[PDB]
Design a protein around this ligand. Structure first.
Ligand SMILES: [Mg+2]
Lengths: 657, 1129
DNA sequence: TAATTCTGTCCAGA
DNA sequence: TCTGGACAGAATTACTGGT
DNA sequence: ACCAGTTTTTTTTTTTTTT
């Protein structure tokens, strides 16, 4: 059926059951001007919540400025303000997903929305309470896929009200005594705000660190499973949401071998060029340059340190942090960029060269080298390593954001740059106004993606046919097979709860004397009480890796002690939705994940990307644009490499303006 | 109450000595027979606590008191020192009880009069605040009236306020304020009393006034001979105590004193804390003041100051020289951190070597990227030199006047005479500890002396812009001059007899105990030890007192791993209406994610121990030793632990009571007696949660037995109280010492620990220097602990802690038939490495080690590297100095001493006292292999098996055998005592000494012998050109100077040397000669360059080989050619 | 001025 | 009081052994 | 080579005296 995603395949709601269980009303201001209705929506909802027993309310179509209100079956909406139009409504009148959102908002009371507490942090001294980290569950339309619905699992934090006037006047949320849920209250001494805008609280997408089900329950996906359980608990079969599976056509995996070969190919190309290191900081910590050189040394690349940039060489300019400068005049980086206008060089802050532990950071060095190689390829306008063939006769374009930060930049025309492959050389130019007008006309309804908003995306264009291709982040998240993983983790949890009698271990030693696990089991038993059954924690040193160890653990499973098992094998395929590069030509969706085996703790969901195009069938060469493991450092990318090169070119031209 | 009461006393009548008494006494008799009286000694006594250790110590003390009484009738200060005040008080009370209650053959040993006399000879010396608050208002009024000081309104008002407060100061805050006020008042009052007694108005003390003063000042009883036994803490012992005349420092007067130290190993940390407190001094200001004031004040022609000015004359000379060379008159201007152990370790925070330049027009000295390190190093040496001279001057001032009141008088008089009052404090705190230095001539930081960190210390200098005037910088320097081991060795060298009474007194850790390797090397026979027979006697006594096996007591040891599923089930039962154990731990137990894994492990181990304990039917009293207090700050975990304890008590049907906040403060306020009361009166089990620190020495966990509640589990294990029968031992943590007195004190503590590990051989010089660098830049506590964990010293300290805990838990003779020891599995590997002799291990520790079931080899490599590095850097510095004129007088002697030592003793049987850094322990007896660039990094050297194919240091590689066989050189060597062959001993000269010194010295001596056989003669090179040429050759018939240089393979600077020699001494002839080689190659002549020329146009003659190495024939033809060339002029 | 990709606050707007 | 869209912040750029 | 379990520094409480 294919990998799972948060995109909703179907929502099943028994409208008759809802009508038998709840009452629904439609609300909108009566007679008030559309310019003033916003000024009184500030109170409308609060007045509705002050009216009586209102479960929840949901905004409708923006053009209507109306609300759908949910109340118990026997209750009736009564607003003292006569300037409001009110109308009893049946559940069948609402959009299915809007009614689903209303029902979701009502789960906390049936048992602003639904929040699951996942993690709490005690406040510093002189304060009391917790900073609550929760996973919010809510539906949201998918603008990229014709207003299909997605199930969001965003993290959102709560803090005590005690910890400005706006903060004081916010929904005074409250945490449950059980601590399972967080819900709005009048005097609940909680606000939905963290300490800073910094230090953003995050919740793991998946967590199977030690195949621990309890730790799995505290990830976003574990909360999703718990929400699916709570939905049935609250409404049984009357309400259900089915997540859609993306049809699978091609799913390339990425082993460490492929990436390593790609990167040895990459580093070899840089060994043929000269590299220089500079430092323009005031209090010159030359140890930064020494560390950079030593990191480059481990990659066998001829590098040297110079006090000034050298034209024609690959220079790395260690520069002071911009935040310490109030204007561009104080920045040495821009000052030297304005001067050295025709040379490839890269910059980085000194502090980035070491990790939190203080050890040198080699990812920084490798990313610097790869960026230098990409910039050199742009400068020479030729590839220095093998890039798979892209579509023929195509032209790439990339709008560039002006420096103005005013809101009117949203609609302003932008400078547009283009690149093209002729023979072996890459041609880079700024798109002429006639070309941009033709492109805008050809894109039709999709022009808004390239010429409107701050989110202006690059486009592949075919002048000889007018065809185009835009690569859009849909916002849909790809999920592993979390139901099956949860079942396996629960099975392991039940099995590991029972201590193994020594009799079974003695029997295994007797039955398989050739097994080499016995060398370990005899030692373990000798270091244990002959009367007490062994808890699973004693076998932890016996990894489920060798054939004999696998046989031993399988034999224990037959005895009823399910302790260890294979979870991330390709045969199972649980974590396919977060590995390698997945692409579907017919429907033009793709996503990228990790390489090799899934790490036990995955902190993010790979988004599903939608290629919007005019072809009857997308050209095959488009797939080739993603087989590049250095655009995204040592990982499969979701951006075509021509766009990476064009972005680098556009960045270079900034100081030539 | 007088000495006459003992006239009829039988001093030969004594209680039947126990084996411990004999073990204490007979080593001292042997020491007196070997080292003689008034020698001083250190006698560690690994007595297990609980088994008569305190009684034996106090009995020995009482026997010494009786010996003093006997000597007084026929015709010495006794100290009992321990870290804790309550321990001191308990020891004094126990001594009084022993005096009152001792019986011999059924009758009281001492009559009431004798008892009173003996109890009057014992003194307790608490801190000044407690000393004042212990005095009754009558005593203070009597003292004030007797000294007519009550007429002073300030003193009277303050005393009235103190008296008023003392009557109702029950509130802890009011009590603290009262303590501070009492301390300050005591300080002021004693200052006034001492001032009054110093002057011509000295008050005669007698009758009630004398008794009142003695009650106020027990040091007065010590001074006037009324008492000679003092009970005081180590802090008070180091600080000294006041008498009516001045403050008395025991350290300065240890000749003949007996010093009983309880918990000897613990005193290392106390002494280190005391040492690390000394203030940071601005070196620039110090040297400027010294030079200016030495210029200002010159002399005084009085008898008192005879032999004083000559002590400072060298200091005057060097102060003027240093001021001129570095232009100290100029202001210093451009934080920078410099660290140095004064010997082979020199770390700086700056990435670029900072240098000092002088601008005369600016009238400033500029620090920019003369090295800065050299400036501070020279200034520090002068500053220490000045303080050392004061110590000598003060001593001489006494001999002129003829050591406590006169000592301060001498310090004040000398400082006033030289106008250096600003250094009076520095001098006092220098003399208190460093002034006890007996190894003054034992180490001048010279290679010819006995070099060690423990009597060298370390220096730490901060360079920063001066506050209030940023145009200048100040070099604030803090330093140690000795380590706690150095202080102990100096105490023993001063004549003190020290009884170190502590189980694990020889723990084999330099961080948590004195460096006993250094103490052995430093003391020799003075470091006493128990023979195998004495240790066997002690073991037999302990077994008789703790006969476990014969009485059927079973020690059940259980090592526990982290139990995640068990803890998960417990957490899920606690708050059953929850979902995730991780959430329960995070939300309800309040544990952050960064510590969740660690908390899970240690909490699970603790709860498994508690479950096993409650499951057992008979055991009643469990003690849990964690590294953290489960007090109110962790109440959330205490609630869960209480839930688990209640669950298991209900499951196994036995009442259990938990004591969570068992803590030093809880022990003071609530008292440990509550647990004993509960055990004595309440049926069921008891679980006590404490820590290794909380259960320190002196805390007695016993409880009174009530046989109705004990069932039949108790068995008397001796040939009514019982103790802990179950224990959980968490792995000791935070094993690196730290000081919180100040930031600089903590830095000194950390650097002392690092340098102590390097000195002991636990760290290679590379690792030690890297750790010092990381510490200087400000490494984290956790990284310091990671560095420490790599050493075996860490494992030794952990084993010491575990042994101390288990020993302290075993203080009775009533044992339960089963004793449960639960141990964190992290201790299994550490305890499995225990390999010391188990003769003195406690039964619990023996069981721990058996259930688990510092390599000299590692130390040999590290010490070889350390000695080679020290030799390399010391020789480099010495040669550089020899290439400077003024310092030639002493450096020449040092150079000659080193060369003579190496020639005379290429290899030695025993670790030398002096020249100890010239050798390394070869591990191969008389030879060894090594690799390393002698001109490169000294940290890169490797030795012995690590380099089988490396260069070799042996008698063969220097060709001594082919040199001294059939030649004139053998009579030379035999006459001068040089070694004709290498004795195959363990200690061999380091690679640097072998290559850079010994092999050149052999050539020099051989050349001198061979040429003197042909009527030549030599004189020492003048200091101006010393060490640039071997010797100056004198021969009949030639008036021109002749210079000789015996160095192989140019070991272009030769032309510069020739020019420098000639420009001063005029035209001269030079001889270049290799002692060994082959005659096959012709003699050559040269003219101030490597290009040769005709004989008569040449001033340099090269003899390629004076001696044929094939058979050791003398190349007489070369000698004749040399003579002819000399005579030709 | 590490880069890419995903995402948590946050704020105006309908 | 809803809600979705920008806009900076945070994590990830593995490891190692068995086959 | 490849594929899937393993995995990651260390983890405080305590003391005396003189100012
Ligand atoms: Mg860039």
């Amino acid at each position: 059926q294919g990998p799972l995603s948060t995109l909703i395949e179907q929502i099943s709601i028994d409208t008759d059951w809802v009508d038998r269980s709840f009452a629904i009303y439609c609300v909108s201001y009566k007679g008030i001007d559309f310019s003033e209705r916003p000024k009184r929506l500030v109170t409308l909802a609060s007045e509705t919540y002050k009216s009586g027993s209102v479960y929840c309310l949901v905004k409708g179509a923006n053009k209507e400025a109306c609300y759908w209100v949910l109340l118990p079956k026997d209750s009736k909406l009564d607003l003292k303000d006569t300037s409001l139009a009110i109308k009893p409504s049946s559940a069948a009148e609402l959009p299915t997903w809007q009614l689903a959102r209303l029902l979701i908002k009502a789960i906390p009371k049936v048992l602003e929305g639904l929040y699951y507490l996942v993690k709490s942090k005690k406040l510093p001294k002189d304060h009391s309470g917790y900073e609550l980290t929760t996973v919010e569950i809510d539906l949201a339309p998918c603008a990229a896929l014709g207003f299909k619905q997605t199930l969001s699992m965003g993290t959102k934090t709560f803090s005590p009200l005690s910890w400005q006037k706006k903060a004081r006047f916010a929904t005074r949320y409250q945490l449950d005594d059980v601590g399972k849920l967080v819900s709005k209250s009048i005097k609940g001494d909680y606000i939905k705000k963290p300490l800073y805008s910094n230090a953003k609280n995050r919740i793991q997408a998946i967590d199977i660190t030690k195949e621990s089900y309890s730790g799995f329950q505290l990830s976003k996906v574990g909360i999703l499973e718990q929400f699916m359980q709570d939905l049935k608990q609250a409404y049984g079969d009357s309400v259900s949401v089915k997540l859609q599976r993306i049809p699978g056509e091609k799913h390339r995996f990425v082993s460490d071998t492929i990436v390593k070969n790609h990167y040895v190919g990459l580093f070899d190309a840089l060994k043929e060029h000269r590299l220089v290191i500079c430092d323009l900081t005031e209090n010159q910590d030359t140890d930064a340059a020494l560390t950079l050189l030593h990191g480059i040394e481990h990659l066998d690349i001829n590098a040297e340190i110079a006090e000034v940039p050298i034209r024609g060489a690959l220079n790395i300019l260690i520069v002071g942090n911009k935040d310490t400068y109030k204007s561009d005049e104080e920045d040495p980086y821009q000052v030297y960029r304005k001067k050295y206008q025709d040379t490839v060089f890269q910059s980085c802050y000194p502090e980035r060269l070491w990790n939190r532990q203080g050890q040198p950071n080699r990812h920084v060095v490798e990313v610097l080298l790869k960026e230098l190689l990409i910039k050199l390829e742009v400068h020479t306008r030729k590839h220095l390593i093998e890039y798979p063939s892209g579509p023929e006769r195509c032209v790439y374009y990339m709008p560039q954001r002006p420096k103005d930060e005013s809101s009117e930049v949203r609609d302003e025309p932008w400078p547009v740059y283009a690149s093209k492959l002729v023979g072996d050389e890459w041609q880079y130019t700024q798109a002429t106004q006639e070309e941009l007008e033709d492109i805008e006309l050809d894109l039709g309804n999709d022009k808004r993606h390239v010429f409107h908003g701050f989110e202006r995306s690059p486009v592949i264009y075919w002048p000889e046919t007018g065809d185009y291709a835009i690569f859009i982040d849909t916002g849909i998240q790809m999920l592993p097979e979390f139901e099956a993983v949860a079942e396996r983790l629960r099975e392991l949890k039940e099995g590991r709860s029972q201590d193994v009698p020594i009799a079974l271990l003695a029997q295994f030693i007797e039955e398989n004397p050739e097994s080499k696990v016995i060398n370990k089991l005899r030692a373990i038993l000798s270091e244990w009480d002959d009367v007490a059954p062994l808890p699973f924690d004693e076998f932890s040193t016996i990894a489920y890796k060798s054939s004999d160890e696998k046989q031993f653990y399988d034999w224990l499973r037959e005895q009823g002690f399910f302790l260890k098992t294979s979870i991330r094998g390709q045969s199972e395929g649980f974590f396919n939705a977060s590995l390698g590069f997945f692409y579907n030509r017919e429907q033009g969706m793709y996503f990228a994940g990790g390489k090799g085996s899934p790490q036990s703790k995955i902190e993010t969901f790979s988004h599903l990307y939608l290629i919007k195009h005019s072809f009857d069938a997308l050209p095959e060469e488009v797939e080739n644009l993603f087989d590049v493991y250095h655009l995204r450092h040592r990982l499969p990318t979701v951006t075509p490499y021509p766009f990476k090169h064009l972005r680098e070119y556009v960045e270079m031209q900034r100081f030539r303006s | 109450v007088s000495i006459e009461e003992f006239t009829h006393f039988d001093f030969q009548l004594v209680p039947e000595p126990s084996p411990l008494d004999l073990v204490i006494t007979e080593p001292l008799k042997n020491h007196i027979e070997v080292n003689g009286v008034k020698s001083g000694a250190l006698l560690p006594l690994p007595f297990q606590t609980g088994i008569g250790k305190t009684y034996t110590a106090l009995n020995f003390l009482l026997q010494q008191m009786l010996e003093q009484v006997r000597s007084e009738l026929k015709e010495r200060l006794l100290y009992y020192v321990t870290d804790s005040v309550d321990n001191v008080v308990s020891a004094k009370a126990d001594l009084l009880k022993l005096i009152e209650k001792q019986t011999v053959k059924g009758e009281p040993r001492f009559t009431l009069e004798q008892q009173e006399y003996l109890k009057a000879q014992i003194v307790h010396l608490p801190n000044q605040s407690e000393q004042l608050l212990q005095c009754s208002d009558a005593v203070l009024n009597d003292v004030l009236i007797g000294f007519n000081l009550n007429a002073e309104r300030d003193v009277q008002a303050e005393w009235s306020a103190i008296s008023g407060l003392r009557r109702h100061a029950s509130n802890p805050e009011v009590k603290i304020s009262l303590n501070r006020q009492a301390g300050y008042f005591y300080r002021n009052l004693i200052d006034r009393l001492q001032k009054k007694q110093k002057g011509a108005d000295r008050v005669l003390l007698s009758g009630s006034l004398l008794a009142s003063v003695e009650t106020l000042l027990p040091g007065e009883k010590i001074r006037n001979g009324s008492a000679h036994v003092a009970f005081l803490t180590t802090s008070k012992f180091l600080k000294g105590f006041h008498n009516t005349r001045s403050r008395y420092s025991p350290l300065r007067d240890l000749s003949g004193a007996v010093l009983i130290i309880d918990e000897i190993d613990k005193q290392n940390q106390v002494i280190l804390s005391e040492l690390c407190k000394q203030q940071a001094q601005d070196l620039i200001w110090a040297i400027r003041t010294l030079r200016a004031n030495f210029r200002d004040h010159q002399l005084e022609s009085s008898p008192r100051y005879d032999k004083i000015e000559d002590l400072f004359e060298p200091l005057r000379e060097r102060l003027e020289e240093f001021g001129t060379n570095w232009n100290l008159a100029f202001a210093f201007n451009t934080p920078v951190r410099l660290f140095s152990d004064r010997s082979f370790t020199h770390v700086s925070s700056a990435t670029h070597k900072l240098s000092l330049k002088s601008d005369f027009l600016r009238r400033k000295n500029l620090i920019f990227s003369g090295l800065l390190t050299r400036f501070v190093n020279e200034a520090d040496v002068i500053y220490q030199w000045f303080l050392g001279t004061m110590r000598k001057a003060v001593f001489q001032y006494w001999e002129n006047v003829r050591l406590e009141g006169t000592f301060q008088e001498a310090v004040q008089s000398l400082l006033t005479h030289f106008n250096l009052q600003e250094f009076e404090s520095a001098v006092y705190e220098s003399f208190d500890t460093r002034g006890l230095r007996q190894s003054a001539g034992g180490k001048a930081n010279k290679l010819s002396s006995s070099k060690s960190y423990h009597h060298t210390g370390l220096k730490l200098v901060e360079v920063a812009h001066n506050q209030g005037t940023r145009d200048t910088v100040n070099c604030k320097a803090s330093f140690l001059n000795t380590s706690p081991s150095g202080v102990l060795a100096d105490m023993v060298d001063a004549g003190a007899v020290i009884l170190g009474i502590s189980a694990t007194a020889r723990a084999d850790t330099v961080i948590h105990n004195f460096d006993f390797k250094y103490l052995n090397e430093r003391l020799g026979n003075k470091l006493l030890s128990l023979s195998r027979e004495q240790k066997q006697r002690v073991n037999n006594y302990y077994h008789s007192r703790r006969n476990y096996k014969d009485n059927g007591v079973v020690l059940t040891v259980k090592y526990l791993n982290s139990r995640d599923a068990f803890l998960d089930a417990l957490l899920e039962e606690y708050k059953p209406e929850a979902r995730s154990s991780h959430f329960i731990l995070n939300h309800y137990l309040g544990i952050a994610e960064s510590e969740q894994a660690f908390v899970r492990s240690w909490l699970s181990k603790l709860l498994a121990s508690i479950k096993a304990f409650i499951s057992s039917p008979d055991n009643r009293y469990m003690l849990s030793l964690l590294n953290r207090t489960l007090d109110t700050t962790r109440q959330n975990i205490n609630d869960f632990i209480q839930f688990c304890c209640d669950k298991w008590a209900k499951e196994f049907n036995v009442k259990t009571k938990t004591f969570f906040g068992v803590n030093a403060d809880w022990m003071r306020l609530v008292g440990y007696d509550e647990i004993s009361k509960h055990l004595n009166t309440e049926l069921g089990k008891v679980v006590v949660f404490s820590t290794y620190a909380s259960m320190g020495a002196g805390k007695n966990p016993d409880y009174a037995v009530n046989l109705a509640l004990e069932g039949e589990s108790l068995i008397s294990v001796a040939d009514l109280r019982s103790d802990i029968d179950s224990i959980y031992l968490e792995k000791p943590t935070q094993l690196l010492l730290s000081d919180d007195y100040s930031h600089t004190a903590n830095q000194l503590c950390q650097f002392h620990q690092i340098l102590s590990l390097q000195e002991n051989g636990e760290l290679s010089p590379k690792s030690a220097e890297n750790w010092c660098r990381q510490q200087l830049m400000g490494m984290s506590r956790e990284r310091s602990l990671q560095q420490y964990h790599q050493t075996s010293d860490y494992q030794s300290a952990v084993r010491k802690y575990i042994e101390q805990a288990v020993g302290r838990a075993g203080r009775t003779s009533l044992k339960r038939k089963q004793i449960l020891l639960f141990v964190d599995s992290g201790l299994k590997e550490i305890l499995a490495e225990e390999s010391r002799d188990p003769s003195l291990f406690s039964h619990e520790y023996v069981a721990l080690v058996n259930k688990a079931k510092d390599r000299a080899v590692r130390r040999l490599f590290n010490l070889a590297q350390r000695n080679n590095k020290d030799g390399m850097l010391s020789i480099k510095a010495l040669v550089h100095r020899l290439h400077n004129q003024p310092a030639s007088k002493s450096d020449i002697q040092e150079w000659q001493d080193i060369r003579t030592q190496l020639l005379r003793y290429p290899t030695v049987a025993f670790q030398p006292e002096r020249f100890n850094r010239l050798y390394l322990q070869s591990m191969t007896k008389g030879y060894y292999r090594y690799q390393g660039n002698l001109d490169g990094d000294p940290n890169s050297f490797e030795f012995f098996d690590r380099v089988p194919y490396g260069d070799m240091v042996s008698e063969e590689d220097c060709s001594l055998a082919t040199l001294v066989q059939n030649q004139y050189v053998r009579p030379w060597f035999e006459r001068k005592g040089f070694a004709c062959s290498w004795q195959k001993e363990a200690n061999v000269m380091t690679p640097i000494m072998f290559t850079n010194i010994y092999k050149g010295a052999l050539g020099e001596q051989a050349v001198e012998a061979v040429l003197t056989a042909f009527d030549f003669t030599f004189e020492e090179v003048p200091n101006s050109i010393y060490e640039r040429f071997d010797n100056r050759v004198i021969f009949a018939g030639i008036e021109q100077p002749i210079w000789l240089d015996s160095k192989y393979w140019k070991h272009e600077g030769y032309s510069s040397k020739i020019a420098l020699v000639e420009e001063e001494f005029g035209p001269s002839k030079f001889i270049y000669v290799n002692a060994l080689g082959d005659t096959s190659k012709p003699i050559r002549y040269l003219n101030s360059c490597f290009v040769e020329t005709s004989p008569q146009l040449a001033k340099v003659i090269e003899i390629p080989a004076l001696i044929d190495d094939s058979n050791a024939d003398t190349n007489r033809t070369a000698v004749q050619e040399l003579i002819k060339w000399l005579h030709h002029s």
